[PDB]
Design a protein around this nucleic acid. Structure first.
Ligand SMILES: [Zn+2]
Lengths: 241, 219, 329, 331
DNA sequence: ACACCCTTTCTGGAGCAA
């Protein structure tokens, strides 16, 4: 519940691969997940391929992967956590917009860990911190480390439901990009320029990029009700074995 | 002297995903000044705690500086910057025939590898940065006059500082606690914005090995 | 050290922007849905704060070249005109990790994360080229800040500061240039035109019948192979205007200043930010100021003798061993 | 390699600017609505930052030919005159995809997102034609860069630089040329004029009757389409001296020789458009190679190593590089 | 025998403003 690699044996039960070396000597942190490798725990020397391009998100330059993050670099872990929230009892999916509606509005009370892929297969699990508090959520989205406050998401959603109550067409006040890629991601629309007051506009610039990315999955004409995502920890474990 | 620093800047700044602490900036400027005196062959960690700021001490170890994270008064609406990393494929083939590049591979891969043409989009804000801290004004203005840019991606020229003003302020008028506080921080400094996180409270705030149980607000 | 290059783009500048931008048959950019629109790829614009016509600041569009594009352009000019001839002329050779580290700052040569002591960090930051950009597997911070290529324009004033009121461009700096791809089988007009083609008139008529079948299928669908006929637009920054470009050096050696100076001496053969087939980005350097001392002439850069001599002794001792030990170990 | 081609158009230049432009009968571009206006097809215009008055750079219009148009003119010149005769004099033939890739950079409108091998990239940039125009399904960088055709004018003095004060041009360089299409049937005069028409006077009277019915329908609309069409098009005036900048970053000697052969065969070529009005005809009065003038009356003088290189390469030219350049990896 | 290279293989949603 402290390091992102803890879910290897806390969220989902797993063990070392038994071809891993035993650490002898002084303390050194794992290159992935920033977990200190003590004396006696199993570790692997660093054998990343040339296709690994996340050297900028490595926690340390010790060139040693802890066994939990050896499990975390496995391909079934890589496509199993392409969109997943890992609570203290299981791994659930956030692929649907109703699942992100559940995650960023009334979050689960566990100290979870949120990963989401901005591409096909990405190293997501180890390079994000564990969110200890529901109010402050660390979301990994591709090369982006995002922080989402569900209270600010609730305030923006209440603002949007106020300015779009009674109207026939649900027009968004501020445009949000799902990929977080367009220039106008966070830019105020003309309808939102005419239908929001000044302090609401400064609020919509003042939100964090993670809240913008979350609102991108929950600001559209059909509004997703918070529905808990389907539990996928059985699918990941079966794939892992 | 219990003072407040405002920074106004010409280009819009690379928007920090996490908190941009004033003590982090002053520690980096002190590291640059230590590189100016004692050369480049130094440990940066011996000097970025030697700052013109007071230190708040938590009850069980875990001190923090009295600086605060920077607040943005956004003069402009937020935009997004695309940048790309591409290795020159044509120049690679020319160097591979000429022998200057010893590459045995015949075909590249934009998916992954040395020729991965990657795209990454990160936020951009023009703002005014306001921070609150308890420190000597002379050393803070010396470090900030040594400062020329603030924010991330400084190698691609983002967010050079047009100017700064450093003035004393009242004790009740400064929230310095809007800052990555320790988990056992004393509750008059822990507001509703502060929440529990795996976060650094000190020094290199990017060093995930130094990330601790922390109570931090959100930019 | 604050090198500052004032340039003038002889040809248009086209640094392409993301997103799906569209334009009508006239100059109306991004029309509402329900009118014929064409794919426009615009120049790199950023919204900047400016105080023009008022004491307060407003968001104005400023069409710039990114500092990433100028930084890699300076890097590739350095390599192509200085470093690759120096490594070639002594017979030094680069592995793929060292090549990727030197030419892209890329860490895939040693993606495990190379630990770096402070002594080798100091020697690598004192290297003539490695210390400028850094990065790669060791993730090193370079001595070089490369600003965006900012046009000397009234929207850029808060960026530019004082000293640019004269020769200051005003109004719009962009123009949409329309480009089309013609299907050249339609331009086959005689037996001599098609005699080079295998099949000849039969293959040409097969292409015509394929084009008519695809057009009829598209017309029936609108009530997936794309043809060669395309009509699109690209917004460029207009040629002939003046830009400034700031390259700051955070405590450099004289060899590093000489390397930036030698890059700027050979930079007019390079192109700023794309548009390559249309010769876009060709420019001349109107001035170079080294900490405010105007140092550029028609015959490159006069003066700065210590920097050029230091980079001469740096290039005389420039081997690929430093590059390979900066990348791998 | 820097090549600078100063030409002189002896016919008007008409590179039609896309858009919906109109003009009054008096000659005012884009009038306010209410007054009678005719369709004007303006020539292509590049906005250029120039020095109007003293030290006042402003964006002014200067009417040009696009670099894409001149690049395709250069491509089709060396294609029709050099590459295709070299392929015809031997047994080499191209597929329709290879012909399409050679003439327009691609065989299909959909490229494949995979790039090709470094060996094939290097050999295609070593090719005389494919190196200049590197297209194909896998997008190559062609080392030929082709600038727009700029008129030597005051408005391009920040474009031209020094060395262009001779044969100087100021003021407007464009003119609106009006064109009318008359109905042939109204120009019928007698039974001898109508004997070649099936039906003759009956068919002619039917044409007048449909024109009268359509005119009454148009009068009911105002207060199909006939053949009367009075309209306008703006051209760039003849006699101008133009600059054309051709650039080649580290070319093979055969490639710059191929550019030189194309510049030799620019005789009887039309620059932009307006074919039937003989627009785009021009005379090259200068070619400078890296600032060294190499043009005479009998084509390019000097530059012999480029010509021997391109002659050796055209002797070695085949269709195999064209076929495997156009061959899609997805296909 | 351990290093680089050349291939497959694999899980989900879906709306869109200037
Ligand atoms: Zn780990």
């Amino acid at each position: 519940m402290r390091y992102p690699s803890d879910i290897v044996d806390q969220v989902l039960k797993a063990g070392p691969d038994k071809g891993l070396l035993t650490w002898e000597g002084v303390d050194a942190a794992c290159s992935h997940c920033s977990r200190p490798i003590q004396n006696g725990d199993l570790y692997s020397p660093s054998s990343v391929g040339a296709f690994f391009s996340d050297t900028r998100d490595l926690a340390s330059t010790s060139r040693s992967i802890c066994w939990r993050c050896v499990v975390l670099r496995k391909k079934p872990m890589l496509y199993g956590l392409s969109a997943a929230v890992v609570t203290q009892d299981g791994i659930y999916s956030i692929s649907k917009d109703v699942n992100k509606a559940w995650l960023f509005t009334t979050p689960p009370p566990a100290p979870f860990l949120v990963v989401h892929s901005s591409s096909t297969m990405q190293h997501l699990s180890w390079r994000t911190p564990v969110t200890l508090d529901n109010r402050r959520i660390h979301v990994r989205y591709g090369p982006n480390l995002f922080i989402v406050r569900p209270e600010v998401v609730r305030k923006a959603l209440s603002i949007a439901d106020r300015v779009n109550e009674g109207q026939k067409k649900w027009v968004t006040p501020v445009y949000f990009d799902r990929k977080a890629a367009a220039m106008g991601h966070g830019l105020i629309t003309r309808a939102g320029a005419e239908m929001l007051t000044q302090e609401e506009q400064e609020f919509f610039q003042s939100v964090t990029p993670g809240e913008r990315w979350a609102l991108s999955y929950l600001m559209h004409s059909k509004r997703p009700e918070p529905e808990v995502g389907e539990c996928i920890t059985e699918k990941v474990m079966t794939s892992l074995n | 002297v219990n003072l407040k620093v405002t920074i106004d800047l010409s280009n819009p700044m690379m928007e920090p995903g996490d908190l941009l602490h004033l003590d982090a900036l002053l520690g980096a400027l002190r590291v640059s000044r230590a590189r100016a005196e004692h050369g480049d062959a130094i440990n940066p960690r011996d000097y970025h705690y030697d700052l013109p700021l007071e230190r708040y001490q938590a009850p069980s170890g875990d001190w923090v500086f009295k600086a605060s994270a920077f607040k943005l008064k956004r003069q402009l609406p937020n935009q997004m910057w695309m940048q790309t990393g591409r290795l020159s494929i044509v120049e690679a083939a020319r160097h591979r025939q000429s022998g200057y590049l010893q590459l045995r591979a015949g075909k590249p891969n934009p998916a992954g590898g040395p020729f991965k043409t990657s795209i990454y989009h990160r936020p951009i804000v023009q703002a005014e940065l306001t921070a609150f801290c308890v420190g000597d004004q002379q050393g803070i203005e010396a470090l900030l006059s040594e400062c020329r840019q603030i924010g991330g991606k400084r190698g691609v020229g983002f967010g050079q500082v047009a100017g700064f003003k450093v003035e004393p302020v009242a004790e009740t008028d400064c929230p310095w606690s809007w800052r990555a506080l320790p988990a056992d921080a004393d509750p008059r400094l822990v507001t509703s914005e502060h929440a529990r996180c795996i976060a650094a409270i000190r020094g290199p705030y990017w060093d995930r090995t130094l990330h601790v149980e922390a109570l931090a607000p959100t930019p | 050290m604050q090198i500052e290059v004032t340039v003038r783009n002889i040809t248009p500048i086209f640094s392409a922007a993301p997103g799906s931008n569209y334009i009508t048959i006239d100059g109306t950019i991004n029309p509402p849905p329900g009118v014929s629109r064409f794919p426009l790829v615009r120049t790199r614009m950023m919204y900047v704060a400016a105080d023009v016509g008022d004491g307060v600041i407003k968001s104005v569009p400023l069409q710039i070249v990114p500092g990433n594009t100028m930084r890699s352009l300076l890097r590739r000019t350095m390599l192509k005109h200085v470093i690759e001839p120096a490594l070639v002329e002594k017979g030094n050779k680069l592995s793929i990790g060292a090549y990727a580290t030197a030419y892209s700052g890329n860490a895939t040569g040693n993606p495990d994360g190379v630990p770096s002591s402070f002594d080798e960090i100091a020697t690598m930051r004192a290297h003539p080229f490695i210390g400028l950009f850094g990065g790669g597997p060791r993730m090193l911070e370079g001595r070089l800040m490369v600003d965006s290529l900012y046009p000397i324009h009234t929207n850029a004033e808060r960026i530019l500061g004082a000293g640019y009121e004269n020769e200051m461009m005003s109004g719009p700096i962009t123009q949409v240039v329309w480009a089309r791809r013609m299907d050249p089988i339609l331009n086959l007009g005689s037996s001599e035109d098609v005699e080079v083609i295998n099949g000849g008139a039969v293959a040409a008529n097969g292409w015509i019948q394929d084009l008519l079948a695809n057009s009829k299928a598209a017309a029936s669908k609108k009530k997936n192979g794309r043809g060669l006929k395309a009509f699109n637009a690209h917004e460029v920054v207009i040629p002939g205007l003046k830009w400034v470009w700031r390259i700051s050096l955070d405590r450099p050696t004289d060899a590093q200043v000489g390397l930036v100076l030698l890059a700027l001496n050979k930079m007019t053969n390079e192109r700023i930010a794309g548009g390559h087939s249309k010769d876009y980005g060709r420019f001349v350097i109107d001035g170079v100021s080294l900490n405010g001392e105007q140092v550029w002439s028609q015959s490159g850069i006069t003066g700065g003798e210590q920097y050029f001599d230091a980079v001469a002794e740096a290039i005389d001792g420039l081997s690929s061993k430093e590059f390979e030990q900066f990348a791998q170990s």
